[PDB]
Amino acid sequence: GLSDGEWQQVLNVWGKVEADIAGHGQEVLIRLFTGHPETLEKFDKFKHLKTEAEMKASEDLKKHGTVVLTALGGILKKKGHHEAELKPLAQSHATKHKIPIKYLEFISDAIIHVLHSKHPGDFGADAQGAMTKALELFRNDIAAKYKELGFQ
| Alpha-carbon torsion (40, 43, 46, 47), positive or negative | positive
Please tell me whether residue 24 binds ligand NO2 under the rule CB under 6 A.
no
Distance from C-alpha of 120 to C-alpha of 139, rounded to nearest angstrom: 24
Please tell me whether residue 150 binds ligand NO2 under the rule CB under 6 A.
no
Q: Which of residues 122-141 bind ligand NO2 (CB under 6 A)?
A: 122
Fill in the per-residue mask, 45 to 84: x = in contact with ligand NO2 (CB under 6 A), - = not in contact.
-----------------------x----------------
Please tell me whether residue 88 binds ligand NO2 under the rule CB under 6 A.
no
Distance from C-alpha of 33 to C-alpha of 118, rounded to nearest angstrom: 19
Residue 28 has φ and ψ, to the nearest 5°, of -60, -50
Of 8 and 103, CB closest to ligand NO2: 103
User: What is the DSSP code string of 18-39?
Assistant: GGGHHHHHHHHHHHHHHH-HHH
How many residues touch ligand NO2 under the rule CB under 6 A: the total is: 5
Feature table: binding site for heme b: 93
Feature table: binding site: 64, 93
Q: What is the contact surface with ligand NO2 in residues (CB under 6 A)?
A: 68, 119-122
